[PDB]
Scaffold this motif. Structure first.
Motif, PDB file in Angstrom:
ATOM      1  N   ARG A 139     -10.082 -14.467  -5.156  1.00  0.00           N
ATOM      2  CA  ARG A 139     -10.024 -13.185  -5.747  1.00  0.00           C
ATOM      3  C   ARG A 139      -8.692 -12.672  -6.123  1.00  0.00           C
ATOM      4  O   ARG A 139      -8.363 -11.663  -5.601  1.00  0.00           O
ATOM      5  CB  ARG A 139     -10.847 -12.531  -4.474  1.00  0.00           C
ATOM      6  N   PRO A 140      -8.020 -13.137  -6.944  1.00  0.00           N
ATOM      7  CA  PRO A 140      -6.657 -13.120  -7.193  1.00  0.00           C
ATOM      8  C   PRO A 140      -6.633 -11.726  -8.136  1.00  0.00           C
ATOM      9  O   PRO A 140      -5.483 -10.718  -7.781  1.00  0.00           O
ATOM     10  CB  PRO A 140      -6.326 -13.907  -8.227  1.00  0.00           C
ATOM     11  N   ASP A 141      -7.823 -11.255  -8.761  1.00  0.00           N
ATOM     12  CA  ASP A 141      -7.731  -9.965  -9.428  1.00  0.00           C
ATOM     13  C   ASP A 141      -8.489  -8.970  -8.707  1.00  0.00           C
ATOM     14  O   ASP A 141      -8.597  -7.691  -9.218  1.00  0.00           O
ATOM     15  CB  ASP A 141      -8.343 -10.285 -10.838  1.00  0.00           C
ATOM     16  N   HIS A 142      -8.710  -9.118  -7.424  1.00  0.00           N
ATOM     17  CA  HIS A 142      -9.107  -7.925  -6.409  1.00  0.00           C
ATOM     18  C   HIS A 142      -8.233  -7.162  -5.940  1.00  0.00           C
ATOM     19  O   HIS A 142      -6.967  -7.631  -6.001  1.00  0.00           O
ATOM     20  CB  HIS A 142      -9.902  -8.678  -5.486  1.00  0.00           C
ATOM     21  N   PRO A 143      -8.274  -5.915  -5.604  1.00  0.00           N
ATOM     22  CA  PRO A 143      -7.396  -4.981  -5.119  1.00  0.00           C
ATOM     23  C   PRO A 143      -6.376  -5.847  -3.793  1.00  0.00           C
ATOM     24  O   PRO A 143      -7.255  -6.266  -2.821  1.00  0.00           O
ATOM     25  CB  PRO A 143      -7.695  -3.994  -4.547  1.00  0.00           C
ATOM     26  N   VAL A 144      -5.263  -5.519  -3.713  1.00  0.00           N
ATOM     27  CA  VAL A 144      -4.724  -6.091  -2.170  1.00  0.00           C
ATOM     28  C   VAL A 144      -5.117  -5.002  -1.339  1.00  0.00           C
ATOM     29  O   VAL A 144      -5.090  -3.881  -1.449  1.00  0.00           O
ATOM     30  CB  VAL A 144      -3.066  -5.935  -2.543  1.00  0.00           C
ATOM     31  N   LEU A 145      -5.181  -5.639   0.137  1.00  0.00           N
ATOM     32  CA  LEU A 145      -5.656  -5.044   0.943  1.00  0.00           C
ATOM     33  C   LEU A 145      -4.754  -5.107   2.263  1.00  0.00           C
ATOM     34  O   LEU A 145      -3.794  -5.762   2.159  1.00  0.00           O
ATOM     35  CB  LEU A 145      -7.306  -5.467   1.508  1.00  0.00           C
ATOM     36  N   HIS A 146      -4.989  -4.412   3.439  1.00  0.00           N
ATOM     37  CA  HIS A 146      -4.177  -4.694   4.653  1.00  0.00           C
ATOM     38  C   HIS A 146      -2.664  -4.256   4.028  1.00  0.00           C
ATOM     39  O   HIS A 146      -1.803  -4.756   5.023  1.00  0.00           O
ATOM     40  CB  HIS A 146      -4.277  -6.186   5.203  1.00  0.00           C
ATOM     41  N   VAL A 147      -2.570  -3.300   3.365  1.00  0.00           N
ATOM     42  CA  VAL A 147      -1.253  -2.734   3.077  1.00  0.00           C
ATOM     43  C   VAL A 147      -1.107  -1.130   3.594  1.00  0.00           C
ATOM     44  O   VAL A 147      -1.781  -0.513   3.376  1.00  0.00           O
ATOM     45  CB  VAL A 147      -0.911  -2.649   1.489  1.00  0.00           C
ATOM     46  N   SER A 148      -0.039  -1.255   4.425  1.00  0.00           N
ATOM     47  CA  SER A 148       0.400   0.137   4.862  1.00  0.00           C
ATOM     48  C   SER A 148       0.984   1.079   3.959  1.00  0.00           C
ATOM     49  O   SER A 148       1.203   0.559   2.612  1.00  0.00           O
ATOM     50  CB  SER A 148       1.248   0.013   6.143  1.00  0.00           C
ATOM     51  N   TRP A 149       1.001   2.260   4.193  1.00  0.00           N
ATOM     52  CA  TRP A 149       1.925   3.369   3.440  1.00  0.00           C
ATOM     53  C   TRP A 149       3.131   2.806   3.151  1.00  0.00           C
ATOM     54  O   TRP A 149       3.787   2.830   1.897  1.00  0.00           O
ATOM     55  CB  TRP A 149       1.695   4.519   4.144  1.00  0.00           C
ATOM     56  N   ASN A 150       3.820   2.048   3.950  1.00  0.00           N
ATOM     57  CA  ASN A 150       5.240   1.705   3.780  1.00  0.00           C
ATOM     58  C   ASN A 150       5.172   0.570   2.757  1.00  0.00           C
ATOM     59  O   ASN A 150       6.236   0.297   1.988  1.00  0.00           O
ATOM     60  CB  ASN A 150       5.939   1.551   5.315  1.00  0.00           C
ATOM     61  N   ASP A 151       4.172  -0.289   3.122  1.00  0.00           N
ATOM     62  CA  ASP A 151       4.172  -1.404   2.215  1.00  0.00           C
ATOM     63  C   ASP A 151       3.988  -1.018   0.803  1.00  0.00           C
ATOM     64  O   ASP A 151       4.327  -1.359  -0.251  1.00  0.00           O
ATOM     65  CB  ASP A 151       2.931  -2.450   2.621  1.00  0.00           C
ATOM     66  N   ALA A 152       2.909  -0.147   0.546  1.00  0.00           N
ATOM     67  CA  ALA A 152       2.782   0.408  -0.756  1.00  0.00           C
ATOM     68  C   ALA A 152       4.021   1.167  -1.524  1.00  0.00           C
ATOM     69  O   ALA A 152       4.220   1.027  -2.570  1.00  0.00           O
ATOM     70  CB  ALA A 152       1.535   1.353  -0.698  1.00  0.00           C
ATOM     71  N   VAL A 153       4.599   1.875  -0.812  1.00  0.00           N
ATOM     72  CA  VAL A 153       6.124   2.735  -1.038  1.00  0.00           C
ATOM     73  C   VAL A 153       7.013   1.400  -1.228  1.00  0.00           C
ATOM     74  O   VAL A 153       7.496   1.559  -2.667  1.00  0.00           O
ATOM     75  CB  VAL A 153       6.749   3.498  -0.061  1.00  0.00           C
ATOM     76  N   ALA A 154       7.193   0.199  -0.868  1.00  0.00           N
ATOM     77  CA  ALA A 154       7.975  -0.785  -1.216  1.00  0.00           C
ATOM     78  C   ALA A 154       7.519  -1.439  -2.507  1.00  0.00           C
ATOM     79  O   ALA A 154       8.506  -1.609  -3.501  1.00  0.00           O
ATOM     80  CB  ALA A 154       7.881  -1.808  -0.144  1.00  0.00           C
ATOM     81  N   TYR A 155       6.335  -1.730  -2.447  1.00  0.00           N
ATOM     82  CA  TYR A 155       5.771  -2.193  -4.009  1.00  0.00           C
ATOM     83  C   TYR A 155       6.100  -1.176  -5.071  1.00  0.00           C
ATOM     84  O   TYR A 155       6.649  -1.632  -5.901  1.00  0.00           O
ATOM     85  CB  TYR A 155       4.146  -2.579  -3.846  1.00  0.00           C
ATOM     86  N   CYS A 156       5.750  -0.019  -4.976  1.00  0.00           N
ATOM     87  CA  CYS A 156       5.716   0.870  -6.050  1.00  0.00           C
ATOM     88  C   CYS A 156       6.941   1.011  -6.499  1.00  0.00           C
ATOM     89  O   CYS A 156       7.561   0.965  -7.806  1.00  0.00           O
ATOM     90  CB  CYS A 156       5.041   2.009  -5.791  1.00  0.00           C
ATOM     91  N   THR A 157       7.983   1.011  -5.406  1.00  0.00           N
ATOM     92  CA  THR A 157       9.463   1.285  -5.800  1.00  0.00           C
ATOM     93  C   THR A 157      10.267  -0.124  -6.517  1.00  0.00           C
ATOM     94  O   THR A 157      10.835  -0.041  -7.567  1.00  0.00           O
ATOM     95  CB  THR A 157      10.327   1.819  -4.554  1.00  0.00           C
ATOM     96  N   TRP A 158       9.868  -1.115  -5.812  1.00  0.00           N
ATOM     97  CA  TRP A 158      10.037  -2.215  -6.406  1.00  0.00           C
ATOM     98  C   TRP A 158       9.806  -2.514  -8.001  1.00  0.00           C
ATOM     99  O   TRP A 158      10.363  -2.839  -8.870  1.00  0.00           O
ATOM    100  CB  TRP A 158       9.550  -3.466  -5.815  1.00  0.00           C
ATOM    101  N   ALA A 159       8.466  -1.942  -8.451  1.00  0.00           N
ATOM    102  CA  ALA A 159       8.050  -1.953  -9.581  1.00  0.00           C
ATOM    103  C   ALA A 159       8.551  -0.838 -10.729  1.00  0.00           C
ATOM    104  O   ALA A 159       8.146  -0.888 -11.790  1.00  0.00           O
ATOM    105  CB  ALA A 159       6.571  -1.971  -9.661  1.00  0.00           C
TER     106      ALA A 159
END
Ligand SMILES: *[C@@H]1O[C@H](CO)[C@@H](O[C@@H]2O[C@H](CO)[C@@H](O)[C@H](O)[C@H]2NC(C)=O)[C@H](O)[C@H]1NC(C)=O
Ligand SMILES: [Ca+2]
Ligand SMILES: [Ca+2]
Length: 272
Positions: free
Chosen positions: A102-122
Motif C-alpha cells: 500500500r505505497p500509495d495509501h496515506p501515511v499513518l501513525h504520524v504525530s503533529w510534530n512528525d507532520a511539521v517535520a515532513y512539511c517543512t522538509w518539503a
C-alpha cells in the motif's frame, strides 16, 4: 504519479463553521466570515512513498517509533482504540503488518510534530484550520461535504468512510475497509482528493471551542493550547457514532499523539 503535487487555492472569503452545528461540543458554531489569501494545498494526503522519501533523506524517526507504540483500531487487529507495541507508519497494525502492498495509501501513525517535520522538509507547512476548511469546501458555500449536501450524490461514493454497523462490521461498500490510495475518489472543486474521509488530517492550530463571529483575515487559531486541531474524518467514521466527515467538523489531539487513522497534507504560500 505526482503524489506531491499542489493546487492553487484561490483568494476568497468564506463562512467557517456553521450556525447549525451537528456536534455542538466541538465548537462547530458559530458560523463566521473568514478571508483567506491565495495559497497552495497538496492535492493528496501525504502517502507512504512520499513519507519514505523524507525518511530516506533525513533519517527521521517518528514519535511513535521512539515511544514504541501507537493507537490501532481493534477491528483491524474508546474501547476500540488499543495502544499497540510496534505499531507505526511502516507497520500500521503492529509489528507483523507492512506497507509494502500500500505505497500509495496515506501515511499513518504520524504525530503533529512528525507532520511539521515532513512539511517543512518539503518546503511547505501545515495548513491552518481556516485554510484547511476553506479548501475542503471546494468553492461551495455552507454545504455539509466538499461536493454538496448529499452523502452519495448520484448514488456514487465520494469519500472513504465506514458502511455497516460500527465497530463490528465494515461492509467495504465504498471499495475500502481500511485506507484507500491517496488519489482515490473524485476531487472536490479545487482539485483535492480525500479531504473528508480516508485519513484524518492535522492542521497547524491550537484547539479551542470558543470562537467569535468577528470577521478575520488568515486566522491562525489561539495563541496557546494543549491540543492541536485535526480535520476531515477518516475511513472509520459513520453517522451512527461519529459524523466528522463534514468540512465544518473538527476534533483534536495532543501534538505527540498518533493513530492508525490520522495523517496529513501540506500547504505553502508559494510553490516550493
Ligand atoms: C528509500 O531508500 C531505499 C533504500 O535505498 C530504497 O530502496 C532501494 O532502491 C534502490 C533503487 O531503486 C533499489 O535498487 C533497491 O533494491 C532498494 N533497496 C531496498 C533495500 O529496498 C527506496 O526505494 C527509497 N524509497 C523511496 C520512496 O524513494
Ligand atoms: Ca470505506
Ligand atoms: Ca483525509
Amino acid at each position: 504519479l505526482a503524489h506531491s503535487k499542489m493546487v492553487p487555492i484561490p483568494a476568497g472569503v468564506f463562512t467557517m463553521g456553521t450556525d447549525d452545528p451537528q456536534i455542538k461540543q466541538d465548537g462547530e458554531a458559530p458560523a463566521r466570515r473568514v478571508t483567506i489569501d491565495a495559497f497552495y494545498m497538496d492535492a493528496y494526503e501525504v502517502s507512504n512513498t512520499e513519507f519514505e522519501k523524507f525518511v530516506n533523506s533525513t533519517g527521521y524517526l517518528t514519535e511513535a517509533e521512539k515511544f514504541g507504540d501507537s493507537f490501532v483500531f481493534e477491528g483491524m487487529l474508546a474501547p476500540w482504540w488499543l495502544p499497540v507495541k510496534g505499531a507505526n507508519w511502516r507497520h500500521p497494525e503492529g509489528p507483523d503488518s507492512t506497507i509494502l502492498h500500500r505505497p500509495d495509501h496515506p501515511v499513518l501513525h504520524v504525530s503533529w510534530n512528525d507532520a511539521v517535520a515532513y512539511c517543512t522538509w518539503a518546503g511547505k507547512r501545515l495548513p491552518t484550520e481556516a485554510e484547511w476548511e476553506y479548501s475542503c469546501r471546494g468553492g461551495l458555500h455552507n454545504r455539509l461535504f466538499p461536493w454538496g449536501n448529499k452523502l452519495q450524490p448520484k448514488g456514487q461514493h465520494y469519500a472513504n468512510i465506514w458502511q455497516g454497523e460500527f465497530p463490528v462490521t465494515n461492509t467495504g461498500e465504498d471499495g475500502f475497509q481500511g485506507t484507500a490510495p491517496v488519489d482515490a475518489f473524485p476531487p472536490n472543486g479545487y482539485g483535492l482528493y480525500n479531504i473528508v474521509g480516508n485519513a484524518w488530517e492535522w492542521t497547524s492550530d491550537w484547539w479551542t471551542v470558543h470562537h467569535s463571529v468577528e470577521e478575520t483575515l488568515n486566522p491562525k487559531g489561539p495563541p496557546s493550547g494543549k491540543d492541536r486541531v485535526k480535520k476531515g474524518g477518516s475511513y472509520m467514521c459513520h453517522r451512527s457514532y461519529c459524523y466528522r466527515y463534514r468540512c465544518a467538523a473538527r476534533s483534536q489531539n495532543t501534538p505527540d499523539s498518533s493513530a492508525s487513522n490520522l495523517g496529513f497534507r501540506c500547504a505553502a504560500d508559494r510553490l516550493p
